Amino acid sequence: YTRVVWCAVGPEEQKKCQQWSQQSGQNVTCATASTTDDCIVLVLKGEADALNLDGGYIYTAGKCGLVPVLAENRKSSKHSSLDCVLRPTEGYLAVAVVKKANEGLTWNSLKDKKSCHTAVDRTAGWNIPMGLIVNQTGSCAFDEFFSQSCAPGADPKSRLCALCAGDDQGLDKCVPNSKEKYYGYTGAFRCLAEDVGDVAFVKNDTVWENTNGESTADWAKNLNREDFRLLCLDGTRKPVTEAQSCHLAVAPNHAVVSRSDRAAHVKQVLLHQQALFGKNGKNCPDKFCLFKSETKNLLFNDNTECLAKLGGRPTYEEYLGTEYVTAIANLKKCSTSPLLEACAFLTR
């Protein structure tokens, strides 16, 4: 079994993964589930080997005994010296984003507003904001804080899914995959853009990448980053240019996880797939580009330069950092997740 089985979340990821397999000569093959949690179960059971996860999902994989292998790396501010694969990773910036023409809306007037979330359990979409809201209100009732939300992966019957749109035909509302119109960094921003929500919980990069002709998609085509502001924790609003002083927190980068027994194999194969199909890939763009989709962050973020090595011998705890682990642990006391309950005994 030299093939590395990649877990694709949803049918759009599955098409890119099938492409990847064909061009990889089955050095990579595809399993699919409708959700990230399902894919974490596939890797647990050895029906799949790996997938690239948001840090919040890495927490779930970690509790279930999976390990981080390689981290997403985007273009930094300084070094063009060190190779991308050896270059220190820079955490992305979790921001709350509002329309500039919705004056009166601050961090402190968020209660019973409409929210857009990348999905439940994701770092910028959910762990960071809802962690802060629960901590500030001293209440576990984050499910009643917003009047209405789109938070893919929530209970589809609840107000947390009220604003989710699903497919073109409106099927699979609130399913935490890319077939849901408002799923992900893209989808949550599109949710704020089409004014379905008052606030979107996304990362700094998402705002830039979908404004001022930077995206070619018809909803994002004619968007100006002047029509948007960033809610800061100090109550103030600011332009999207001052993310560095107006962000909720710094997220650890999306990273690949595997079973321990498969990590070395998965690492070696990916370093080589990156060399062939990465940013400066021998076979990118004529054959296949690993880090490009229909600008819909399939398998990897489209802004991924390469997958980088980590420190020596890292656990999910070391990778995410003690602080973000404690913030997650605390928010999770207000909830139960099936996978966290199922796997709880492994790290207790």
Ligand X SMILES: *[C@@H]1O[C@H](CO)[C@@H](O[C@@H]2O[C@H](CO)[C@@H](O[C@@H]3O[C@H](CO)[C@@H](O)[C@H](O)[C@@H]3O)[C@H](O)[C@H]2NC(C)=O)[C@H](O)[C@H]1NC(C)=O
Q: Which residues are annotated as a binding site for Fe(3+)?
A: 54, 92, 185, 254
Distance, in Å, from the CA atom of 333 to the CA atom of 311, rounded to the nearest integer, reads 30
Strands 67-73 and 306-308: antiparallel
Q: Is 123 in the site for Fe ion (CB under 5 A)?
A: yes
User: Taking contact as CB under 5 A, which single stretch among the options 115-123, 135-143, 193-201, 281-289 is the one that binds Fe ion?
Assistant: 115-123
Asked whether 48 and 254 are in contact (CB, 8 A), the reply is no
**CB-based contact 152:120 (threshold 8 Å):** yes
Alpha-carbon distance of 39 to 10, in angstroms, equals 10
Q: How far is the CB of 163 from ligand NAG (least distance, A)?
A: 28
Q: Distance between CA 81 and CA 86 in Å, rounded? A: 10
Binding positions for hydrogencarbonate are 118, 122, 124-125
Question: Judged by CB under 6 A, which of 196, 243, 246, 248 binds ligand X?
Answer: 243
User: How far from the centroid of its chain's Cα atoms is residue 201's Cα?
Assistant: 11
CA dist 189 and 116 (Å) reads 8
Closest approach of Cβ 23 to ligand NAG, in Å?
Answer: 7
Among 14, 21, 24, 60, which residue sits at the site for ligand X (rule: CB under 6 A)? 24
Nearer to ligand NAG, 24 or 258 (CB): 24
Residue 22 site contact among ligand X, ligand NAG, Fe ion, none (CB < 5 to 8 Å, cut-off depends on kind): ligand NAG
Q: From the CB of 323, what's the least distance to ligand NAG, in Å? A: 8
d(CA 66, CA 125): 22
In the region spanning residues 21 to 80, those forming contacts with Fe ion, defined by CB under 5 A, are 54
User: Which CB sits closer to a second copy, 25 or 312?
Assistant: 25
CB 252 within 8 A of CB 54: no
Compute the C-alpha angle 342/347/348, nearest 5°: 90
Find the shortest distance in angstroms from Cβ 253 to Fe ion. Answer: 8
Q: Is 147 exposed, middle or buried (0-12, 13-18, 19+ CB in 10 A)?
A: middle
State in angstroms the smallest separation of the CB of 4 from ligand NAG.
10
Identify what 208 binds: ligand X, a second copy, Fe ion, none; CB under 5 to 8 Å per kind: ligand X
Encoded one letter per residue, x for contact with ligand X by CB under 6 A and - for no contact, window 73-112 reads: --x-x---------------x-------------------
Q: Where do contacts with Fe ion occur on this chain (CB under 5 A)? A: 54, 123
